[PDB]
From a paper:
SARS-CoV-2 enters host cells through the binding of the receptor binding domain (RBD) of its surface trimeric spike (S) protein to the cellular angiotensin-converting enzyme-2 (ACE-2) receptor. After the ACE2 binding, the S protein is cleaved into S1 and S2 subunits by host cellular proteases including the transmembrane protease serine 2 (TMPRSS2) to promote fusion of viral and cellular membranes for viral entry. Moreover, B8 proved to be the most potent HuNAb, capable of inhibiting authentic ancestral SARS-CoV-2 with an IC50 value of 0.013 µg/ml and an IC90 value of 0.032 µg/ml, respectively. To understand the potential mechanism of action of B8 HuNAb, we performed a cryo-EM single-particle analysis of B8 Fab bound to the SARS-CoV-2 spike ectodomain trimer.
The B8 Fab appeared to bind to the receptor-binding motif (RBM) of the RBD through its heavy chain for most of the interactions. Therefore, the cellular receptor ACE2 would clash with the B8 Fab due to the overlap of their respective epitopes on the RBM. ACE2 and the Fab share overlapping epitopes on the RBM (dotted black circle), and the framework of the B8-VL appears to clash with ACE2 (dotted black frame). The elucidation of the epitope revealed that B8 could be grouped into the SARS-CoV-2 neutralizing antibody class II. These structural findings were further supported by neutralization assays using a panel of pseudoviruses containing naturally occurring mutations. Indeed, the E484 K mutation from the South African SA9 strain, which is located within the B8-binding interface, caused a major loss of neutralizing potency for all the B8 isotypes tested: IgG1, mIgA1, mIgA2, dIgA1 and dIgA2. The comparable neutralization profiles of these NAbs against the full panel of viral variants also indicated that the conformation of key RBD-binding residues remained unchanged after engineering of the constant regions of these B8 isotypes. In line with the ELISA results, B8-IgG1 displayed the best KD value for RBD binding (169 pM) and the strongest competition with ACE2, which explained its potent neutralizing activity.
Residue numbers in the entry:
A (entry chain C): 317 to 593
B (entry chain A): 1 to 214
C (entry chain B): 1 to 224
């Protein structure tokens, strides 16, 4: 019995589907103020975090819940993406268990945070001469924000115990404040666009996660195959057979797997066990 | 209502020295204090905000410090366009009150005021009002007293004073006082005079004229 | 760069109303925050109130409440500071300056230009130029001061020049002082060497614009 072992292993998966367009979240024309941030929700797609990591254009990519390199292996039910613009000296506040005026009651991250945060400097779009007054932030609030809560009300904050009646006055502050984004500003006062991905694992089946890595096929050699999960060994060769449109693999007499269709060319292959004995 | 008070009132120096202004707050503004500069016949412009942040375009010689109730604006090297009035505003809470001001002057050697007195003209005497003008010319410093003695009688409550700005060639001032009175009063008296008492004058100079005889 | 173009000078009467505008040059408003500051003649600065244009919030200081009303027109980018029951002590130069969204912090960085509001009960009267002859030719034998004295004109300003602008060395034009009657007055003297007296003739030409008066008073010695 010349029971040899396969030369190597080959994995083959279907073609890359919809590319899950993050491009409208990172290359958007205008972001939102930190007090009113976007929460675009992702769904069934193929998320490619690889380009995000090796982009060589971001300043902060500190990632908390999961390892950056395992992003393409773990698979999640749903993914969110928050987006806003803040100052340089304030990006340090976008982290679990942090305090300040823009992390405490502008954007609170939970302690058990599992997603992670991206931020890059853009002092060429959000900063114009004379000031860019399209970017506001709240600096007064009755109470602290609980994690992942949005507040956009603009009732005049009453600091004291006097009635205030909707106008500014003694101990009546306007809740919001503007960023004086001027080109001539040192780092730490310049705008910083921030995107916060928050992966969710809900009781529903996972629909959003990374692409599978296929490899080139080999014929008439003994290898270890993996076609959409089913694994084993055997020679792969063409066969004058047919499968129904919806059926991927067949099971022979004595109920064993005998032929599988590779999900790249829709071509039928027979898994003949490598000659033994 | 927070009351700000600046000190001193004039703070006159020389070009090239170092200035030090104070904006002693009444209450306790945390650190919100803005410094403005107003040149004569112009609008104020912001220099230092948040008590330490220099506004855009401001030269590096303007430095601010202080916190709580005592602040300070310091100019390291005075330049000819650094002589103006400086205001400080507390942006703590309603209402944003301002301060008094500090007219940063220019210092120079003490000068003696030239004195001229002009009797009323006969054209101006056609009506019932006669005005006598005593002119103080090219003196320094600003402080100078002018007092009238009509027939050696002290005149008060009827004269008005006007002083020019500091000259741009020799930093000397100029003063003019007017003796506003009726024709009947003018024709009832004989001798008019104005006296000038200045720091740079050894003795109070007094020039006089006799009514009609001129 | 933002600009704040403002209205022009407005002479009024006691008990009347004044409406100062502060149009934003560059289009419409944004999250600016605009405050109104006035400065009395020969005094400091005073803060009256502020408006939030886009968020629709505006009121004035407790001293000015019930009398001032700040409004805005976001379509035209123009803010108004209508002031009622004008009093004789309400004459000043009114400014408008953007100061950033919230009222604590940054400060007014871009100012307007000033809107002089003169409130009195007098009518546009021409100046009465009277000569200040070079009297008492005994001072120093080589120096002399002479000049005309503009009196009883309203309102400001009047511009005095000597020899049609050909003489400016040693020329002093004192600020106008408001008399009790309600009319202004200012002098204008020039220092002249005693040698030129009796050979050169000096003539001060006043130019009052409200009453378009052009007077030419030649100043001479004391009728010899």
């Amino acid at each position: 019995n010349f029971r040899v072992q396969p030369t190597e292993s080959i994995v083959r998966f279907p073609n890359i589907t919809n590319l899950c367009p993050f491009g409208e979240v990172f290359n958007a024309t205008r972001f939102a103020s930190v007090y009113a941030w976007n929460r675009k929700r992702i769904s069934n797609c193929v998320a490619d975090y690889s380009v995000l990591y090796n982009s060589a254009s971001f300043s902060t990519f500190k990632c908390y819940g999961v390892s950056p390199t395992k992003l393409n292996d773990l698979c999640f039910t749903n993914v969110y993406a928050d987006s806003f613009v803040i100052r340089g000296d304030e990006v340090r506040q976008i982290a679990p268990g942090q305090t300040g005026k823009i992390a405490d009651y502008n954007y609170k991250l939970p302690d058990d945070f599992t997603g992670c945060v991206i931020a890059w400097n853009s002092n060429n779009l959000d900063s114009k001469v004379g000031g860019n007054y399209n970017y506001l932030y709240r600096l007064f609030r009755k109470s602290n924000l609980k994690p992942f809560e949005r507040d956009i009300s603009t009732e005049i904050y009453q600091a004291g115990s006097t009635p205030c009646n909707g106008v500014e006055g003694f101990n009546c502050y306007f809740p919001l404040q503007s960023y004086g984004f001027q080109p001539t500003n040192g780092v730490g006062y310049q705008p910083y666009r921030v995107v916060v991905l928050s992966f969710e694992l809900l009781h529903a089946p996972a629909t959003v996660c990374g692409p599978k890595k296929s490899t080139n096929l080999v014929k008439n050699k003994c290898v270890n195959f993996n076609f959409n999960g089913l694994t084993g060994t055997g020679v792969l060769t063409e066969s004058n057979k047919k499968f129904l449109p919806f059926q991927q693999f067949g099971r022979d007499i004595a109920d064993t797997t005998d032929a599988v269709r590779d999900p790249q060319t829709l071509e039928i292959l027979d898994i003949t066990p490598c000659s033994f004995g | 209502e927070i009351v700000l008070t600046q000190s001193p009132g004039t703070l006159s120096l020389s070009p090239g020295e170092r200035a030090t202004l104070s904006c002693r707050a009444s209450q306790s503004v945390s650190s919100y204090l803005a410094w403005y500069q107003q040149k004569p016949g112009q609008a104020p412009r912001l220099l230092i905000y948040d008590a330490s942040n220099r506004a855009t375009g401001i030269p590096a010689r303007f430095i601010g410090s202080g916190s709580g109730t005592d602040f300070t604006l310091t100019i390291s090297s005075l330049e000819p366009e650094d002589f103006a009035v400086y205001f400080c505003q507390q942006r703590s809470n309603w209402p944003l009150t301002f301060g008094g001001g500090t007219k940063v002057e220019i210092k120079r050697t003490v000068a003696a005021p030239s004195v001229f007195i002009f009797p009323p003209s006969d054209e101006q005497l056609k009506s019932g009002t006669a005005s006598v003008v005593c002119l103080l010319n090219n003196f320094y410093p600003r402080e100078a007293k002018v007092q009238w003695k009509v027939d050696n009688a002290l005149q008060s409550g009827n004269s008005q004073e006007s002083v020019t700005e500091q000259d741009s060639k020799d930093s000397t001032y100029s003063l003019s006082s007017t003796l506003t009175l009726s024709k009947a009063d003018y024709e009832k008296h004989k001798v008019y005079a104005c006296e000038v008492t200045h720091q740079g004058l050894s003795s109070p100079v007094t020039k006089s004229f006799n009514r009609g005889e001129c | 760069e933002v600009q704040l173009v403002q209205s022009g000078a407005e002479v009024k009467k006691p008990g009347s109303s004044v409406k100062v505008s502060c149009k934003a040059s560059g289009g419409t408003f944004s999250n600016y925050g605009i405050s109104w500051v006035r400065q009395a003649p020969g005094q400091g600065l005073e803060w009256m109130g502020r408006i939030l244009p886009t968020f629709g919030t505006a009121n004035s200081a407790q001293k000015f409440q019930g009398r001032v009303t700040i409004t805005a027109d976001e379509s035209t980018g123009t803010a108004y500071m209508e002031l009622r029951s004008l009093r004789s002590e309400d004459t000043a130069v009114y400014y408008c300056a953007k100061e950033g969204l919230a009222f604590l912090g940054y400060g007014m960085d871009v100012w307007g230009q000033g809107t002089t509001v003169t409130v009195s009960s007098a009518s546009t009267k021409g100046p009465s130029v009277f000569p200040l002859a070079p009297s008492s030719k005994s001072t120093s034998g080589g120096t002399a001061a002479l000049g005309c004295l503009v009196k009883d004109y309203f309102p400001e300003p009047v511009t005095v020049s000597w020899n049609s602008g050909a003489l400016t060395s040693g020329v002093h034009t004192f600020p106008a002082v408001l008399q009790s009657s309600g009319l202004y007055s200012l002098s204008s003297v020039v220092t002249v060497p005693s040698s030129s007296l009796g050979t050169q003739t000096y003539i001060c030409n006043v130019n009052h614009k409200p009453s378009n008066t052009k007077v030419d008073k030649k100043v001479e010695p004391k009728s010899c």
